[model samples]
Target: TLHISDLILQASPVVQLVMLILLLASIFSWYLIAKLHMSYKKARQDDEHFQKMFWSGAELNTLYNNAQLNSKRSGLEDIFYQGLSEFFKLKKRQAPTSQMIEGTERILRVGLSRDQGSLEYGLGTLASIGSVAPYIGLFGTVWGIMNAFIGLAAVDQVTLATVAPGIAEALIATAIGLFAAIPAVLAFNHFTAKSESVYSDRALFAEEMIALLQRQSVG
Candidate 1:
């Protein structure tokens, strides 16, 4: 078996380019994975923290105040603040039913959209890497094999040793492509599911919260 350096160092220019591209993609994808993971974790944490505080025996005003104070009030709190901020303003002047409903829903939806945009920022890049990486590898492999055959015409005698390096180098591209693609694909799916879970909790809360507030007012 050729050393890792031997396979890459001796690879054709096109194959080297392919390897470098795949390597860069993998590195970037991993970085995105780390960033997204941290983002999601914080979102999940803040959401739980805010929800806990809201449900606790503390004054509801304190809950709102704390959320306002928190710069990183991410995820569910983002939706909560949007709904509550308008509620505070409109309720002061005794806004009408239509005003309350529309204001609550409009602000909450806009804030939810913003949070979703942040959540989905780099996911398309992951999907792009997963889908396109194999083809890039194949392109390099095909180019390397073509070069190998072209070299064959110059040799009067054909043997395994004469062809071994070329075939090996061609296969390296496919290997690297998979190296870049597999994790990205896996992380994309996992994050997508988790994001959906968080969104559902937030969306449902926004809807129910407004109705609850309306009932409180009627009571």
Candidate 2:
């Protein structure tokens, strides 16, 4: 049974501003969450596709061609293509053994760095929201309570009727802050763990590919 006027009068200016900040944080959190989910999904799918193609017993050249043809959305596949392309380009140029492998590894490392950066892009914002939101909400609560106490001093007596509204208004900020923060913290931890697992997979794939190339060169 809350009227529009009651809602409008419930929060002070500071509380309203805190609520606004929480709203913006929630929006950004959702945006990052959706984007990261899609990115991770594509990476996982591409990793599976690449593994199947690699284990199908295709020659390196054929695998390279197939990777190029099939890798429309995979970050891992893109990294593989970059490394292999550099290796072939150097081989064509008759580059020295040490120089060629070094160059190829460097190219792959660049791709790895890019993938890591993209995966971690929004994590800082999430961390900030989780760490700072509660304090901001508490500030609103403190301000509201101070106003209520000041009002009590102006009057002869303080009762629940006079004090309850101010305290309730103040608590709203803290509640909204928690509402904005809890999901962000959970999402950040989940994504961090998932990204680490994916990065390990990428590193393992790179090592296996390098070993295969070394065997081919010896033969």
Candidate 3:
């Protein structure tokens, strides 16, 4: 069996370009996977920390103060902070309870989408690469096989050895394409699910805050 490098080096220029593009795509996808994995992890940690504090009987004012002190806050924390801040503002002016809830909920939804934009960033690119890479690989394989057959027509008494290298190189394009695509597809799905999970968690938290404010006002 020829070394994989031998197959690639022996491939036609167009096939080589296909391989190059596929390799770059694979590299980029892996980079995004690593980056997004860390991002999601950190966001989860932030939410965990804040939620624990929130449920631990601390004052909402204290939580808000601490959140404000932190240089960075997660979507959940931002939702809490902004809702509480708006509630406090409205309370000072003698706004009705319904108006306060309406104002705070509005702020919460805006923060939800803002943080969601950050969370889901680059996901679409991953989806596109995953969907397209296999086809690109197939195109390279087809082109390489066509060239191999064209070469076969030029010579008489073609044997397996004469044709093997061309076919192998062609297959390598597909192999590399899958290498680029599988992780991208997998990560896209995984991250998208996690993104949705976090988004819903934030939404639920927003509802909880509104309920808390409603009870406080009624009492």
Better of 2 and 3 by lDDT: 3
Candidate with top TM-score is 3
Query: Over the stretch 95-184, how does candidate 3's per-residue lDDT look in tens digits?
Result: 678877888889888888888898877999999999999999999999999999997986879999889888998899999999999999
Clash count per candidate? 0, 0, 0
lDDT tens digits, residue span 1-219, model 2: 544347436577877787778778878888888888887887788778778877789788886786678746447667888899889887888766777777777887899989899768888888898889888888877887887777678677777877777777777778878888898899889988988898888888888888888778767
Off by over 4 Å in 1: none
How would you encode candidate 1's per-residue C-alpha lDDT over 1-219 as one tens digit per residue? 679888998778999999999999999999999999998988888778866776677866676787788896667766787688788888788667777888888998899889889778899999999999999998889999999999797778899999988998998898899989998999999999998998898887777777777787777
Which pairs of residues have clashing backbones in candidate 2? none
lDDT of 2: 0.80
Candidate 3 deviant stretches above 4 angstroms:
none
Record all residue pairs in model 3 with backbone atoms less than 3 Å apart, i.e. clashing. Answer: none
- What's the ranking of the predictions by TM-score, best on top? 3, 1, 2
Top candidate when judged by lDDT against the true structure: 3
Off by over 4 Å in 2: 1-9, 69-73
TM-score, predicted candidate 3 vs. hidden true structure: 0.94
The TM-score of candidate 2 is 0.91
CA lDDT, every prediction?
Answer: 0.86, 0.80, 0.87
Poorest 10 consecutive residues by lDDT, candidate 3: 70-79
